[PDB]
Design a protein around this ligand. Structure first.
Ligand SMILES: CC(C)[C@H](NC(=O)[C@H](Cc1ccccc1)C[C@H](O)[C@H](Cc1ccccc1)NC(=O)OC(C)(C)C)c1ncc[nH]1
Ligand SMILES: CC(C)[C@H](NC(=O)[C@H](Cc1ccccc1)C[C@H](O)[C@H](Cc1ccccc1)NC(=O)OC(C)(C)C)c1ncc[nH]1
Lengths: 99, 99
């Protein structure tokens, strides 16, 4: 599809069956979400942005369904004020920025 | 053009004469640059990032040249880890996000 950017590109995705709305972020390296419980097998991390750093819980090989595609990829869960899908999940779907 | 998001979409902008590497960001409602100072006539703002709230200096009608275009926009200066061109300049340039 084409997101023209006059509204925030918010899309509904299913992460291991849970339904969540996420912002398609070209400015983020990772996809950080909150509100899904994915289990005790994570690698602890810390990522930065406008306002400072945040501790994350990284999970690899996660079943993701977003925009008619189904991919497997790394999602981080943490206290992020906005759910985000960064370039690691946008490249898996083959999305791109066009001029 | 098309940017495939495998590498961070950073380009060169010349904000009112001055050269700056900026990140093409769809997750951003505004554009915030650091390391340039645009002057005393600004309106203070607060915007929220991932680590929390920052204060920015907002300058309206800033002439910009990115890719082959000469546009005018609102640029904010503040404490960002990376210079970002958000949805207000991307729509001005006419860029889209596609799958
Ligand atoms: C939530 C994350 C995905 C996103 N942050 C990033 O993409 C940031 C952008 C950034 C660039 C340069 C310095 C600091 C931060 C990247 C992550 O913080 C850091 C970058 C970094 C490296 C070394 C020390 C400190 C930071 N990278 C990261 O976590 O993952 C990689 C893929 C590079 C290993 C962000 N963008 C906007 C708001 N938050
Ligand atoms: C470049 C900044 C503006 C950007 N922040 C935003 O886009 C933020 C965050 C956001 C993104 C997506 C969905 C909801 C909220 C919106 C801005 O913070 C705020 C909205 C807001 C203000 C006060 C309290 C709460 C929200 N917008 C803003 O200052 O600019 C306008 C002119 C649109 C009002 C950011 N920081 C890190 C990544 N993106």
């Amino acid at each position: 599809p084409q997101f023209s950017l006059w509204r925030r590109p918010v899309v509904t995705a299913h992460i291991e069956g849970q339904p969540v709305e996420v912002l398609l972020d070209t400015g983020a390296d990772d996809s950080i979400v909150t509100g899904i419980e994915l289990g005790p097998h994570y690698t602890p991390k810390i990522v930065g942005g406008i306002g400072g750093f945040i501790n994350t819980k990284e999970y690899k090989n996660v079943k993701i369904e977003v925009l008619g595609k189904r991919i497997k990829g790394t999602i981080m869960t943490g206290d992020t004020p906005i759910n985000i899908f960064g370039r690691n999940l946008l490249t898996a779907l083959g999305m791109s920025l066009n001029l």
